[PDB]
């Protein structure tokens, strides 16, 4: 353990993702609310999750009767070095197939 | 670890209370709404967890 400095040695469930986050940014999208009684001028939120799995960014969107940001934003397409006919569509359809 | 075999031996961070399990309880409560409309018909959703 003296060895341990860089922050791929170790499995972050502590200190990512824990229990109440989500909470704290539905409530951030009650606080906007108030501003966007009026129409035309709805007040938009995104949230920018990187280095994630697919399950846990589409969290974000929120559920059918609790609203959260509109949507999260998407880099997966920003990650690909290499490009190719297989890697374009695992990307596109693996946003389509998870999100709600 | 041969020798772990009592529960109150462990820290039970990834068997209880993870998350979306709060999301699971706030859509039981959403499903009794449909049959709360009704005034004096109010339907009660208690949670036990000791």
Redesign the interface.
């Known amino acids: 353990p003296d060895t341990v400095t860089q922050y791929s040695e170790l499995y972050h469930?502590?200190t990512t993702?824990?229990?109440g986050?989500?909470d704290i940014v539905r409530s951030f999208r009650q606080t906007m609310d108030q501003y966007s009684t009026e129409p035309g001028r709805y007040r938009f939120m995104g949230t920018e999750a990187y280095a994630e799995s697919i399950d846990r960014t589409v969290?974000y969107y929120g559920?059918p009767?609790?609203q959260e940001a509109d949507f999260p934003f998407n880099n997966y397409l920003s990650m690909l070095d290499t490009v190719s006919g297989n890697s374009v569509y695992e990307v596109i359809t693996s946003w389509m197939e998870n999100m709600p």
């Open positions: 469930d502590f993702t824990q229990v986050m989500h969290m559920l009767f609790i």
